[PDB]
Amino acid sequence: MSFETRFEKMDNLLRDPKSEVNSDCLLDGLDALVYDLDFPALRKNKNIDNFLSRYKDTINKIRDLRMKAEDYEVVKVIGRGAFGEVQLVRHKSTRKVYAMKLLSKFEMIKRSDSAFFWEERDIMAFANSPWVVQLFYAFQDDRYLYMVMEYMPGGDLVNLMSNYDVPEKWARFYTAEVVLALDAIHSMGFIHRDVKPDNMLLDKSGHLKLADFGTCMKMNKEGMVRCDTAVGTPDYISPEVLKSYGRECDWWSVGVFLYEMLVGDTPFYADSLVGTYSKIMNHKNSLTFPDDNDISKEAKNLICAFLTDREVRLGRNGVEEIKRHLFFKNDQWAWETLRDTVAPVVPDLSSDIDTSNFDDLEETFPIPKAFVGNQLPFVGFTYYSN
Amino acid sequence: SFETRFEKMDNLLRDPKSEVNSDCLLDGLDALVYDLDFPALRKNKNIDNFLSRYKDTINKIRDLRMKAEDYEVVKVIGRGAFGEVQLVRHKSTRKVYAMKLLSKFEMIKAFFWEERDIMAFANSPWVVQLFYAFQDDRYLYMVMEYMPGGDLVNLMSNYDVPEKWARFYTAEVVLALDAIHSMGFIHRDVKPDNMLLDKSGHLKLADFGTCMKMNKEGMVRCDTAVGTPDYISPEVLKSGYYGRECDWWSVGVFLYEMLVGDTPFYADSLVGTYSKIMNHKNSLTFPDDNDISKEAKNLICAFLTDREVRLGRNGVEEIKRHLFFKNDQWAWETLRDTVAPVVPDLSSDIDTSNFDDLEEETFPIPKAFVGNQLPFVGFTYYSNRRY
Numbered sequence: 001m002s003f004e005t006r007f008e009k010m011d012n013l014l015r016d017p018k019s020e021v022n023s024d025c026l027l028d029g030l031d032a033l034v035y036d037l038d039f040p041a042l043r044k045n046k047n048i049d050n051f052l053s054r055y056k057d058t059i060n061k062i063r064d065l066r067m068k069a070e071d072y073e074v075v076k077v078i079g080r081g082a083f084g085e086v087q088l089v090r091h092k093s094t095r096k097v098y099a100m101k102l103l104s105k106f107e108m109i110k111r112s113d114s115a116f117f118w119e120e121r122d123i124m125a126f127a128n129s130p131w132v133v134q135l136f137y138a139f140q141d142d143r144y145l146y147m148v149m150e151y152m153p154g155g156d157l158v159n160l161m162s163n164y165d166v167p168e169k170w171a172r173f174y175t176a177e178v179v180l181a182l183d184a185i186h187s188m189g190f191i192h193r194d195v196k197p198d199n200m201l202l203d204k205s206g207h208l209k210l211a212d213f214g215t216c217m218k219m220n221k222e223g224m225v226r227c228d229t230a231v232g233t234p235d236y237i238s239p240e241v242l243k244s245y246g247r248e249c250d251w252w253s254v255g256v257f258l259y260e261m262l263v264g265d266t267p268f269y270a271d272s273l274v275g276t277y278s279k280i281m282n283h284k285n286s287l288t289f290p291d292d293n294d295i296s297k298e299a300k301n302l303i304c305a306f307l308t309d310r311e312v313r314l315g316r317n318g319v320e321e322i323k324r325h326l327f328f329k330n331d332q333w334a335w336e337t338l339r340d341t342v343a344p345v346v347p348d349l350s351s352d353i354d355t356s357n358f359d360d361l362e363e364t365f366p367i368p369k370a371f372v373g374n375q376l377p378f379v380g381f382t383y384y385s386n
Numbered sequence: 387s388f389e390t391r392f393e394k395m396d397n398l399l400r401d402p403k404s405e406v407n408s409d410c411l412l413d414g415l416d417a418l419v420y421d422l423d424f425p426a427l428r429k430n431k432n433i434d435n436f437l438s439r440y441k442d443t444i445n446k447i448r449d450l451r452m453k454a455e456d457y458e459v460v461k462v463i464g465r466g467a468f469g470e471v472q473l474v475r476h477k478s479t480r481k482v483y484a485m486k487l488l489s490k491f492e493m494i495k496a497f498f499w500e501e502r503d504i505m506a507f508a509n510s511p512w513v514v515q516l517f518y519a520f521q522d523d524r525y526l527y528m529v530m531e532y533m534p535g536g537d538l539v540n541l542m543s544n545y546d547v548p549e550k551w552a553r554f555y556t557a558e559v560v561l562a563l564d565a566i567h568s569m570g571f572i573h574r575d576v577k578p579d580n581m582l583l584d585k586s587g588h589l590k591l592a593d594f595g596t597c598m599k600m601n602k603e604g605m606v607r608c609d610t611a612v613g614t615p616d617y618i619s620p621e622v623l624k625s626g627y628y629g630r631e632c633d634w635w636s637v638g639v640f641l642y643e644m645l646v647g648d649t650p651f652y653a654d655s656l657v658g659t660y661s662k663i664m665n666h667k668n669s670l671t672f673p674d675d676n677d678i679s680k681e682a683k684n685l686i687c688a689f690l691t692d693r694e695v696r697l698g699r700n701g702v703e704e705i706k707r708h709l710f711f712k713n714d715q716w717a718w719e720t721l722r723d724t725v726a727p728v729v730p731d732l733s734s735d736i737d738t739s740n741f742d743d744l745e746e747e748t749f750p751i752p753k754a755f756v757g758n759q760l761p762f763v764g765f766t767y768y769s770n771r772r773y
């Protein structure tokens with residue numbers, strides 16, 4: 001390369017939203033260093049003291065100029081999870097409405113889990129699919145991570161399933177939309193691993209979008225992934241993920257969702273968590289349908305096609321072999337124009353902040369005696385849209 | 387407003403004078419990684435995971451950004467306290483520069499800020515120009531335009547300086563010191579070693595180590611002495627509240643040495659010279675030299691007096707008006723456009739004939755976080771520069 005080339009390459013890298021060394025990732029680096037060094041113990045070191053003093057006025061200006069939590073008015077707590085809460089907010093200046101997921105920095109470190117969010121960020125930020133919930137801004141402070149997404153007013157599939165005996169027409173529509181959306185994620189080289197109705201959200205038109213990309217992972221050259229982590233609720237997970245694989249695992253979960261929609265309960269439910277794991281491992285004999293003519297021949301066929309060992313699982317050869325399945329044969333929609341058709345349940349909403357589909361809903365780090373670098377696992381999480 | 391805050395934050399990342407422009411920010415990451423890559427500290431998972439995460443990236447960054455291996459070293463054209471100056475050729479552009487190196491370890495065992503600043507933004511034909519300023523874990527680098535004509539020490543050592551020449555060189559020093567003063571700085575250490583010659587034989591000031599910013603009264607309050615033992619003014623020597631009058635004392639010393647051949651307060655020992663300075667009232671004497679003109683003597687004595695009566699106390703113009711400078715060859719306003727008394731005859735773009743023939747220890751591995759690279763974050767001048 002030439003002199004100019006090297007300069008222009010470096011210059012563009014400061015401007016790239018996919019760059020690790022963007023103007024924003026670099027500002028995080030400084031902001032972190034200053035948080036982890038402002039203690040009296042460490043200030044005994046002159047290098048540390050002089051540095052902090054030198055960058056006092058500057059670090060403050062930035063802390064006040066950059067996007068902060070006090071820039072938003074909180075409207076309602078629309079959810080709760082492991083390491084935080086999701087809330088309906090209004091950006092005080094623009095007056096624009098968003099869903100904001102908060103993640104506790106102290107808790108994440110304590111609970112040793114402090115790297116999942118990376119996958120969740122990139123997916124929502126750059127997916128640019130009508131099937132993925134859109135990330136507009138990502139920011140932070142010494143205590144939390146913030147994800148500013150577009151608000152899904154229709155609620156989740158858990159709420160839908162709880163308010164209707166789902167007819168087969170609807171189950172076909174919702175399964176198909178899940179299939180198209182999982183395929184979009186796979187096409188970005190990702191495996192979800194724990195697909196559940198809690199992750200399936202409804203837009204203002206009643207169409208599907210996937211959310212909460214916690215368990216997601218990037219595939220290797222062979223389209224494969226390795227792990228050994230703590231399973232949450234085993235109910236929706238593939239046997240091979242519990243036994244610990246490729247994207248076949250996400251198709252196992254689709255069969256569990258299609259079962260639950262039509263039967264009313266999950267196929268491997270048991271009292272205890274360990275109970276559910278046993279039923280999954282012994283799927284070959286545990287999977288049974290009730291004696292009511294209700295489920296069609298093809299619905300049963302597709303369920304069993306997905307609820308088998310990976311080696312014979314519908315999907316092992318690709319999306320198209322799932323799409324071709326007779327269960328989907330219909331006179332209402334084409335796969336290529338489905339998200340343009342009329343959704344089976346269209347939400348009737350009172351406002352831009354209607355929260356009718358959502359059910360009605362502080363330990364910090366100690367002072368360190370030496371350098372601990374608690375802010376280091378979060379440098380570069382920041383993101384802004386233009 | 388929302389936009390206002392973006393714009394404000396945006397002008398800050400772009401400003402070459404900003405503390406948080408792309409240049410400083412990249413230095414901040416580069417530093418953190420250097421001060422953390424040790425086995426002791428890597429036992430901390432936060433530290434290990436961070437380093438592993440930013441491995442591939444920090445390397446790309448290091449390979450792209452300006453580094454010392456981008457230059458071919460032609461000769462060591464100097465040495466000083468904290469490093470060496472060398473004639474280099476940028477391997478890609480093939481362009482020739484003088485590069486001053488400063489040992490990061492030795493410095494620890496903050497003058498460079500004033501020096502960097504003056505050379506980068508002076509925008510005067512009297513000041514040596516800074517093009518790039520880069521670093522690493524061991525050195526600071528200052529890429530300046532190469533002065534092929536050498537210093538005034540070399541000139542004075544190869545010629546019996548005639549008065550015509552001494553007038554020219556003094557005048558150019560006067561114009562250049564005034565330029566620094568106009569940037570609100572006291573030079574504090576004016577000497578022939580700091581006076582360099584361009585390809586045309588014209589003056590430029592270099593090595594701005596001792597440079598300090600004047601206050602509202604155009605004064606400096608230093609509790610300790612600063613400068614060279616022979617050029618140091620009585621008031622800096624006993625520091626301390628003083629002004630730019632001190633630089634004019636040194637011009638006197640520089641005038642006397644060019645005409646007499648020796649410094650005015652020279653003595654056997656260094657302590658001896660200090661004594662003679664403090665007694666400038668009786669020590670200043672001229673030899674039986676049927677060549678030092680009446681005015682040359684007058685100007686020397688005008689500068690070599692106590693500050694209260696020193697030529698310059700009222701301003702540059704009273705120095706300029708002095709009869710010593712009365713001549714029919716140049717005007718003050720068109721002097722650097724006149725033909726220099728010694729025009730260097732140079733063989734190439736890398737002719738180093740005016741430079742005498744010339745011919746490493748680092749920080750130990752730390753057991754805990756020391757942050758030895760923190761006093762240098764922001765010294766880089768490459769990404770965000772004034773054009």
Ligand SMILES: COc1cccc(CC(=O)Nc2nc(-c3ccnc(N)c3)cs2)c1
Nearest residue numbers: 080081082083084085099150151152211212
């Ligand atoms: C992993 O730790 C946590 C912490 C807190 C909450 C949760 C659940 C969770 O992930 N909810 C999500 N909600 C949205 C969301 C997007 C658009 N609109 C609406 N209404 C909700 C995206 S992810 C998990």
Ligand SMILES: COc1cccc(CC(=O)Nc2nc(-c3ccnc(N)c3)cs2)c1
Nearest residue numbers: 465466467468469470471484532533592593
């Ligand atoms: C601070 O301690 C040190 C360390 C290393 C060298 C020195 C002497 C010193 O300051 N030399 C200079 N040389 C130049 C220079 C510019 C253009 N062209 C040419 N040929 C030389 C500028 S400053 C002092």
